[PDB]
Amino acid sequence: EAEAKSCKTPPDPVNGMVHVITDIQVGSRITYSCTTGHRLIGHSSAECILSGNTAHWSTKPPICQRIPCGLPPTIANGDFISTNRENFHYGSVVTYRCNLGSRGRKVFELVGEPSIYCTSNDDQVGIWSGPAPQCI
Incomplete structure (x- = not known):
């Protein structure tokens, strides 16, 4: 690389696995999902934005509430x-x-x-x- 800054790899939270499709750095987009039989908290869709200091996903670590x-x-x-x-x-x-x-x-x-x-x-x-x- 050279310069782009990554919004940090999304760590698999409460059972919900992340789908690092394109990438994770700025401009890149992915999708989260609490597998089967689980209510997804927050937002599955996310995009690596950037304020200036460090890249961060516009959303937030999606949770997974048990149905x-x-x-x-x-x-x-x-x-x-x-x-x-x-x-x-x-x-x-x-x-x-x-x-x-x-x-x-x-x-x-x-x-x-x-x-x-x-x-x-x-x-x-x-x-x-x-x-x-x-x-x-």
């Missing part, structure tokens, strides 16, 4: 188990079931998708897969 998911759609009569209990965040899987008096008994049975898990399909909110399970 929070609430409780899974509880089916009538059907119970709830698995890892999930209260500390719901994302990905957590839950196994459905159905009443049985108190210790197993021919009284309603789970049918279809006996298990689900946290996911995303509308930003935050933390929408699961679907309340398909049903007692019969």
Whole structure:
């Protein structure tokens, strides 16, 4: 080189990997992304600007907030188990079931998708897969 000044290589932050496409120095542009299943904080798009002393990205180190998911759609009569209990965040899987008096008994049975898990399909909110399970 000779003179251009680089806005410092963007260090892979909270899970979100940076995409150093063109370069990193002045004029150069890249793109950040919190992989799959993660909300990107700040701005993915960035351009290496320069005030005078040192080159810096017009944006700022993008973060990555974990997509929070609430409780899974509880089916009538059907119970709830698995890892999930209260500390719901994302990905957590839950196994459905159905009443049985108190210790197993021919009284309603789970049918279809006996298990689900946290996911995303509308930003935050933390929408699961679907309340398909049903007692019969």
